Design a protein around this ligand. Structure first.
Ligand code: SF4
Ligand code: SF4
Lengths: 531, 533
């Protein structure tokens, strides 16, 4: 009467649908042997270093076909908005810059995440995590990436680790003698849009589930640089299993799952509800960041078994920096997923002078409604999460709001490392909403009247800008390479250099595109679509 | 310049502080060999079946010392409320019943969760998941536990799997040649109280974190049968990593982590903020389910590294059915954590009788004479219906059918029983979380039924409004003591409707001396309105 059924039964468990290239001469790192009558694989652990170094280098310069196809779809669809096409064209041109292998596609070169599956008879020496970490260390150290990891010295005292370590190393024990990997360079912004809901059987009917999806998709907003790969997981054996499944779904790792359930509780992809998610995404009007049809590239919906008392639900996205790479080591050597190296084949406003008193810039901006396209020329002051917290702390101790918060628009950003002979590394905006609790405070103290970032913000910012005569300008989210190549002409560290990329910067920019999202009158260009 | 630092650096990674017993003669399942100059261990996979079977049998009848000590503390602490002491005494007596090895400590014998760490040179044949699932299958099939897993035939069509499979099998690749395990029999109610928050740097200061903790602890309520083991995880490399860490922290798996951070971003336990969580829990007044000091046994707070743009936060509890067991397989055989087999040594050495065998309207009149917080003793018939029964009945009404008569004659006990031992009137049969049925009460009451419900946990405001509009009541059973309720209170169980469902059928049961509190009355009063405002 006992029948074993694995929850996950992909028809393509080794990802044969993916194209792989072999690292030249890597067969020298492996040797097939036969021990106690079973075939086994000896792996020089240096192969893990070589593979991780290659994976976390290439993933920042190339994309998968299904990602690039989505941007072209937004450009060619007659039903796409002008803003849909403008954003998708900008992201494809950004991918073209990044394919030059110098500038990463996004300033946020992400957290290094390894899902590894070591066969029972795959022998590495056992030091997999150190050797993988060294390859990750090599990738971020010797390329123009960014150190994004924040170490906690105590509960509140933090410092940057200076090398983008630690990685998330999930190494699983599996049958066989191979070593299979999924590498993810996961941006912080899309990682923040991984949501867990604790639901009940009352959700599990067509009307309630549809209303749920419409409600939750809006809470993603534009804060993770859509078009999104949207993943939705209904059920699961625990919260962490639900959240792991929705992460992997967003990486299209479970695309070959079955599409029907059975009495043993196996996972399945549900294509009908993927279609409903896409229809909700399109009919929402949120669009590719600034209103339109292309809120989403595509959807993945996986139904899981559940404890009778439980219904965990996971919602997660892959952002414009859609960065994952499959790989495996076998008796022939190291194989790594081949990404698209010619993204160019997928390609089918008000000038605002900042070199004036800030009050004159505010007056010019006041003349236009939300949704106006602007082009910034001049100085921006760069300050993100930690700078804002330090500045607020200064003011709480009676110190004045610093002068550099009062002279120029505030660009929420953290740059990647500058290539030799370049004016700037990749330097796109960070999510504006995380700074929302500072706006009214800083504006009441005479600064931060104009902010520049990406993502929809909360109502408190709209009230602050109306009360104080402020503005929030929405940059396009994602195109960090073309912004650095075309717009950013000078970068200087201004304050808090110990913060690394989270220091305060002063940059000179030209032809920096943005939208007026919040004006000084109580208007918000997202108030209709993200009510 | 490269320095590798593992995120988790426990000082006791093999759990030497835990007491283990050897499965007799289990050295016959392993043999040491040497290949390519390295020591390896061949393991008969039958050892995984044996180990899983023993783990998921023993864990339902015994508890760890640190859990039992918490209940005794609630009884002996002068600062504990009378209800704190009453609840803790009831849970200890339940544990004494459960230690008889017939009745499981809770009717929800949980999801079977296996965390396994297979050494690189530990060779099982590779079929670990099948052999582990067979041992779990054995434990739930041949013991008086419960089949709690719900399979989805499509998005909305569901059925019970009938054997408590599938398990959650998380088998990790690690150095060495041994096999180390943490087995968890995770109840549904405490699994539902695992929360993920996406926060920011603006949270990371003493005032914001303190206010955050005070706010979130209240959202746990009493819905997962406190006293809780409270785990809080600040940071993490991803949501799923944060939620895995908070789960393991709640099992005290990370008790030996360091207590300070460093520039490499290692995880650490924070004893100062553990004390703050305990102070917030105690000062909340929520208590051991019915007001008091013992909202929490103990706290675990782990600070993790984070991406500069990210601050995921996890909050999770272990409930009164605190069920985990450590184990390992090595060259000497199979070793399994030793749990406390004499819980009675932790036991140290005024209510209104309600006759339910009357017209339901007369029962409502008697209850109307008492304030919330009154302790009652129920004698008579209860109609048992939980999540699926409620959804099926609502579906019937949506298609024009009347609310069934059996929803109007007796109070509704939200519960799902474990299997009945031979010669027993009932298996373990404690209450389910009341909040999950909140959306049905006003509908059912306006159709003349469900005027009196009996379950555990605080409920939402719509239930208080419904009981006021319709002259209804919500009675809070003690949450957890499923074994002593079955042995002492439940005298007869018969299936009334939906036999095709599993333990989620509608049941008709006769009870005696079934204790409960009036939580919501017919006047707008709620016993939790102050502590869970
Ligand atoms: S800035 Fe946008 S594209 Fe870059 S990692 Fe963050 S969410 Fe992704
Ligand atoms: S009923 Fe209470 S003690 Fe039992 S599993 Fe659910 S939350 Fe835990």
């Amino acid at each position: 009467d006992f029948h074993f059924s694995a929850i996950f039964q992909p028809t393509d468990p080794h990802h044969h649908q993916t194209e792989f290239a072999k690292v030249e001469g890597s067969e020298k790192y492996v040797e097939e042997v036969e021990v106690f009558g079973r075939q086994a694989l000896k792996v020089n652990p240096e192969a893990l270093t070589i593979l991780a170094h290659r994976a976390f280098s290439d993933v920042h310069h190339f994309f998968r076909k299904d990602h690039l196809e989505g941007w072209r779809r937004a450009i060619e669809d007659p039903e796409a908005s002008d803003n849909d096409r403008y954003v998708a064209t900008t992201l494809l041109k950004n991918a073209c810059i990044a394919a030059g292998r110098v500038l990463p596609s996004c300033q946020d070169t992400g957290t290094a995440i390894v899902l590894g599956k070591r066969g029972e008879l795959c022998w590495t020496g056992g030091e997999d995590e150190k050797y993988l970490s060294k390859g990750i260390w090599n990738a971020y150290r010797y390329h123009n990436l960014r150190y994004s990891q924040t170490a906690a010295l105590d509960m509140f005292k933090e410092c940057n680790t200076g090398d983008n370590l630690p990685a998330q190393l999930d190494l699983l024990a599996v049958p066989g003698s191979d070593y299979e990997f999924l590498f993810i360079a996961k941006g912080g912004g899309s990682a923040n849009k991984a949501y867990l809901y604790q639901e009940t059987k009352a959700l599990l009917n067509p009307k309630s589930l549809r209303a749920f999806i419409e409600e939750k998709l809006k809470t993603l907003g534009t804060a993770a640089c859509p078009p999104y790969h949207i993943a939705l997981v209904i059920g699961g054996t625990s919260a962490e299993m639900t959240m792991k499944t929705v992460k992997l779904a967003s990486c299209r790792y479970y695309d070959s799952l079955p599409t029907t359930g059975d009495k043993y509780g196996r996972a399945f992809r549900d294509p009908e509800w993927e279609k409903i998610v896409m229809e909700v995404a399109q009919k929402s009007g949120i669009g590719a960041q600034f209103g339109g049809k292309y809120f989403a590239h595509q959807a993945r919906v996986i139904r899981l078994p559940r404890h009778g008392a439980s219904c965990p639900v996971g919602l997660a996205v892959s952002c414009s920096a859609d960065r994952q790479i499959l790989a495996h080591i076998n008796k022939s050597g190291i194989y790594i997923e081949q990404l698209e190296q010619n993204p160019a084949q997928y390609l089918p406003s008000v000038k605002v002078d900042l070199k004036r008193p800030i009050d004159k810039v505010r007056q010019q901006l006041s003349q236009y409604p939300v949704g106006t396209r602007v082009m910034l020329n001049g100085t921006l002051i760069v300050a993100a999460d930690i700078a804002h917290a330090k500045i607020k702390e200064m003011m709480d101790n009676g110190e004045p709001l610093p002068e550099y918060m009062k002279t120029s628009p505030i660009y929420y950003a953290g740059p990647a490392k500058t290539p030799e002979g370049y004016a700037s590394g990749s330097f796109g905006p960070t999510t504006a909403g995380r700074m929302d609790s500072y706006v009214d405070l800083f504006q009441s103290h005479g600064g931060s009247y104009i902010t520049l970032a990406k993502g929809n913000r909360s109502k408190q910012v709209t009230d602050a800008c109306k009360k104080h005569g402020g503005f929030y300008l929405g940059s396009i989210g994602g195109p960090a390479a073309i912004l650095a190549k075309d717009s950013i002409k000078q970068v200087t560290c201004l304050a808090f250099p110990e913060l690394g990329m989270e220091a305060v910067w002063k940059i000179e920019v030209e032809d920096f595109p943005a939208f007026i999202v919040v004006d000084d009158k109580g208007n918000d260009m997202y108030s209709k679509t993200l009510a």
